[model samples]
Target: LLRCRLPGGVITTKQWQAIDKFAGENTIYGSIRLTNRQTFQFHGILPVHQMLHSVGLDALNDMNRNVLCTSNPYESQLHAEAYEWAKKISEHLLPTYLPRKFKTTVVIPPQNDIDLHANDMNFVAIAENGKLVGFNLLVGGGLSIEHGNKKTYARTASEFGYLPLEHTLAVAEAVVTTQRDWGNRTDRKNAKTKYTLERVGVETFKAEVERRAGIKFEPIRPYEFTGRGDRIGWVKGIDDNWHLTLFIENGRILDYPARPLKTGLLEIAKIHKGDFRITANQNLIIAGVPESEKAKIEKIAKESGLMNAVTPQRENSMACVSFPTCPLAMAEAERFLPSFIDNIDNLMAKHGVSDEHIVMRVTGCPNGCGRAMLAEVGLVGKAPGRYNLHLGGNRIGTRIPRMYKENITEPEILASLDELIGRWAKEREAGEGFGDFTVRAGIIRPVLDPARDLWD
Candidate 1:
């Protein structure tokens, strides 16, 4: 899947329409998915015969790495210009190979909404005046096998440093090439640059990058993780207008039209005379609403049956498209998420558990395009109609949650989860989020009960 990151998660209605048209005409699934990162993903490709003609890039070029996320947090000399720089860097991406697949991220000031710590190569841009200044560079971060004693896992780049603005992305590209050539491909498990960095160490990796690029990197500096914001609800844009952040459940919006909420936005967009923006979270935002029109606009939103933009259940649920379209997928997600939420909603109502906005995620497979591993309650696809239940996670946006459950059937998954929630509801301290509850209890395993429904 490719995520075409936007400068500030802002897209004009025209762009959305064009993207919608392109997706309709070319993708294997004939659909475009809006991601939480304010980008779109088009799956299924006709590489040999149609990718270039339809999408402007060859099938091979669609290697899912062409696009890069800006990770913008609104800190730059100029937001629009800084965003353009990110897009320019994205346009210039070129990687040569040897060991494993590579990834890169760029975060400008104000927010580093995406987790740069987990990327293979991350560039935190620091621009001044009209020119690029420099970037805080990070390398060797990844998520893969972490088998005990085997020394296979991700590590942050110890050689923390900065580079001249011009050489920022160039140096990053050179580093990627070095990994491609010198990286260990003999064993695919040890192929990622993260593992390579672990094997050779940061000093060796830095020297190798310099050797390949014929340039020396600057010395290290103390840096801190800054500006991690997932824009939800409404916020004032730099332009003094409203930019609303709507959270999507599992990044799928198909249920909207069926649920009347989807149709509401379509109807509002048709008459509001404003633009709609898609978010990185697979949700939609209606931007540029004149203050005078706010009430009418909100009314339209409610009439379309989308009044609850931040409901507990709505805020907590997220899933990936895991049905017929995804060849790698083993089960269903999009079409079924609503039903699952409905079941939970009814149960929550019956139990007087008012907090439905729990942080939960589900995906069709272990590949985890949905980032299920990081959610409070993650359901990863193991096979058709089966999942690996992961629980005991940090609450909404607290940090990466842990995996507590393993392979489980769907019915059993929900029933067991219900029990956990039931227990938490009875015992949780006032105002404590689930993440805190899990952390305090130190529980991270899928509870087993023979009487619970194993499948339904």
Candidate 2:
């Protein structure tokens, strides 16, 4: 598996074509996989040196790391600015050797596609009087938890106060440098910045970062993100350009039996002068097109049968690349999630909630690659064709869910969800999502195990 970074998820048409050509020539499947981190992965390749050069993408090296930010072009351009800040930080703080990899992200308000609380360092764009000014910094968040090991659990980043736009780069460098010098080096599993913050406490860590970088942070600011993920359709941009978002299942830009997303995109890229942005939800965006070209793009999309194929429920759905691709996978994720979505869609339609938007994610392991733990309804594979059901994560990603059911088959999982959906349809109040409903109804609670610490 070869991964290349596209900062802010933005790539030109020529860069995309080069990647597509490289995939077609090298991979057996003749396609590329869109990662949830807003990057592309070329699976099944040999002699990667030439492939990386041919595509003109920066090799996954130590200095320059991929940065994930908001993909909503309709949102403020601060998202792109934050991406530049992340790149600057990554370049500024290059550690000789750290315990583990460091990850960072930036997210604009009212859109949580980047999962701000799940990265090592997260910068959330702050607005003052409806204008972007600075960022809200959160540190020590990670999601790679060991299965059945309560000691190693997924954690969300905590509030580390705020930073002005001018102080962002300095603070980012301080945070990375602090972790680099003080992080636990012996235990690789517990070596992430999340664990470091846990050991030193947020207040002490913040003070240390401030002392190191000669920058002070402001009090926590106020912001609200109702939900995260991308919307699929043609939408007008703030700059009067049109951006088209298409739902690519599991971020696999492959040609299926009837749907030719890969081929269709290749055709569109050949004529499109606009940029292509990959969303954190595993979707694609044909951004920055003129009004005159809308008809032509839509025509190609229609002929390729990419339009009107995704339902409301499936639009926010995502799955990790498991099975044969990832060695850590214990079951199927990408290959099975589409059919599972179909089953869930049928159930939702039967319950008179076909149009409801419920964010769902699936991963083949407890590693949280698909970000399953942050979804309203999360499915993690416990074994072959069986999964553990997690419930009660809110739309804005402020809460984590508890495991409800353990090791159930697909049909059983669907039946259990059908029952929940039926109850939600009947008892839900105005503006209440399935996640909030489940939490309010006390449908599931965290289990207490005396043998293992739960607060870690």
Best candidate according to lDDT = 2
Model 2: residues with Cα > 4 Å off, grouped in runs: 47-51, 61-65, 73-80, 93-95, 128-131, 446-456
Poorest 10 consecutive residues of model 2 by lDDT? 447-456
Q: What is the lDDT of residue 114 in candidate 1?
A: 49
State TM-scores per candidate: 0.74, 0.94
lDDT of 1: 0.59
Top-TM-score structure, candidate number: 2
Poorest 10 consecutive residues of model 1 by lDDT? 447-456
State the lDDT at 416 in candidate 1. 77
Which residues of candidate 1, in runs, are more than 4 Å off? 1-10, 22-31, 36-38, 42-82, 108-112, 125-134, 144-159, 162-167, 210-229, 253-277, 287-310, 343-357, 392-403, 422-433, 445-456
